């Protein structure tokens with residue numbers, strides 16, 4: 001029996017790690033389960049396109065083609081259908097034309113100025129597939145969904161002859177108060193950090209850098225004596241998004257003293273060091289750091305294999 005607690009700021013990837021466990025260890029979302037996420041996929045897709053359209057007003061970005069102004073009207077008239085799990089051909093076309101507009105694209109590429117789901121491009125690039133008649137979410141479509149965690153989610157699986165129980169709580173500021181309900185009997189903490197959050201600010205507070213907030217939480221948890229004998233595992237998550245992001249958005253927005261290059265390896269290492277240096281007892285307490293892409297089953301499989309090895313060797 002092994003108890004794992006997923007901790008981390010909102011949108012760090014915790015509940016996506018929980019889904020991956022189910023996919024790799026259990027054996028995938030059945031068709032009935034996938035159909036359940038259909039409305040979440042459509043909801044996430046419509047919320048994303050609306051969020052970009054909303055930001056265009058704040059940021060005074062015009063559509064590239066004026067004809068999109070009528071698509072944007074039709075978008076709101078037809079959007080309620082999507083919430084119910086339906087997607088007409090008319091609604092797909094509207095969203096597609098919007099998504100292809102150069103003004104909409106200009107605003108998409110300015111998304112750190114507002115709040116936009118990580119999976120916006122992923123669904124929006126796949127409209128023709130997700131809008132098809134009788135669409136059923138794939139495993140990846142399910143992994144990509146975004147729903148806020150309220151409460152405490154418990155999942156169970158078997159791996160390497162061990163019974164895992166995995167606990168997942170919300171990481172938004174409003175849910176932090178509930179972390180303490182999970183602190184008993186923990187074999188290991190998996191602390192998730194969104195690597196690509198370095199240039200973002202909190203949904204709950206525009207003046208707080210997302211990665212700074214993540215550092216404060218890690219500092220708190222990592223140095224809590226209650227957890228002296230709990231294995232502390234750090235997942236530096238969203239490394240795929242990070243990779244892309246680091247090429248065009250300076251790390252100095254987050255860490256003004258960063259002197260390295262705008263490259264994946266140097267910047268990833270630096271973030272790791274910033275987090276591991278919050279450890280106040282480095283000679284007595286080890287952090288196990290892994291760099292992850294939560295949505296990628298092959299990455300999470302091999303990483304969780306290594307994590308389990310460590311838990312197996314250290315607890316017993």
Ligand SMILES: Nc1nc2c(ncn2[C@@H]2O[C@H](COP(=O)(O)OP(=O)(O)OP(O)(O)=S)[C@@H](O)[C@H]2O)c(=O)[nH]1
Pocket residue numbers: 008009010011012013014015016017117118119143144145146147148149150169170171172192237238239240241292293294295
């Ligand atoms: N591209 C990419 N997307 C990811 C990765 N990890 C998570 N995501 C996506 O990020 C979004 C947020 O992930 P999620 O699992 O909900 O975070 P969370 O920690 O559980 O968020 P919370 O508010 O309830 S506490 C989801 O849409 C998910 O698919 C990743 O490694 N790469």
Ligand SMILES: [Mg+2]
Pocket residue numbers: 014015148149168169170171
């Ligand atoms: Mg969660």
